[PDB]
Design a protein around this ligand. Sequence first.
Ligand SMILES: Nc1ncnc2c1ncn2[C@@H]1O[C@H](CSCC[C@H](N)C(=O)O)[C@@H](O)[C@H]1O
Length: 267
Amino acid sequence: MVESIFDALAHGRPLHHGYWAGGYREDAGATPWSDAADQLTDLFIDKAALRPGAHLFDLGCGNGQPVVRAACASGVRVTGITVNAQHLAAATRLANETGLAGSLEFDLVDGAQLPYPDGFFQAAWAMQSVVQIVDQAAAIREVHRILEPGGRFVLGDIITAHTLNSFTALVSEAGFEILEVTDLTAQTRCMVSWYVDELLRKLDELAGVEPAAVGTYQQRYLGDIAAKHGPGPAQLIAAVAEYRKHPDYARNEESMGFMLLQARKKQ
Ligand SMILES: Nc1ncnc2c1ncn2[C@@H]1O[C@H](CSCC[C@H](N)C(=O)O)[C@@H](O)[C@H]1O
């Protein structure tokens, strides 16, 4: 078994952005990514299927962690899909390990053509799947087909493939009623961007004290990551650290961002 090094570093916690309500730099890292990603999940929970017993279609299911947090908290039945064979496994295994094997089922399926009948689910999700789906139009017309009339559908993903305007076009052009759209760039971060941010934070703090210690502390911090998550992730973060040590990088940071779109199907 060999996992993508992103999956390897996430190490079972979720594959989406961290959501820090009221700003990431504002929070100055008193709240970690590991928790903020769960905050973002709770955010899709709040805004779609608030309802227990209801049924939720998860489009990119990934790890399966966020699905399971929603089926506990809100008491919902879940059907997620993925094309990544190793994601399907992590999610199914996790489902069995929680006693939730009976409500929420995972199936490896291309999201452009869905086996489910029309008007089945009460809600739908796409957490950072749609950018990496190839036929997005088809995928989303399909998801429109899948929901009950009135069912909410909550998408969020990375922006500048697409932009806030272009996503809103994509989703209305499949029939949906768009009732909310938001640029969360201020309030969200990448998993990796966060690990690197902590590293360089504490390194610049240490640097104003004993600069001669910096290399050592860096080596130690990478050590601790290597200890929890395995060496691949440590070697990763080390490299991203080396690249933000160059300012020809500087303005490339915020040239990507995040958005959240809340839609409903008409009654
Ligand atoms: N065409 C497609 N149909 C269904 N899933 C797809 C897909 N293209 C990509 N995906 C899936 O979308 C997922 C994106 S990673 C996002 C995971 C999840 N929302 C979480 O928060 O943990 C991956 O599991 C990938 O296999």
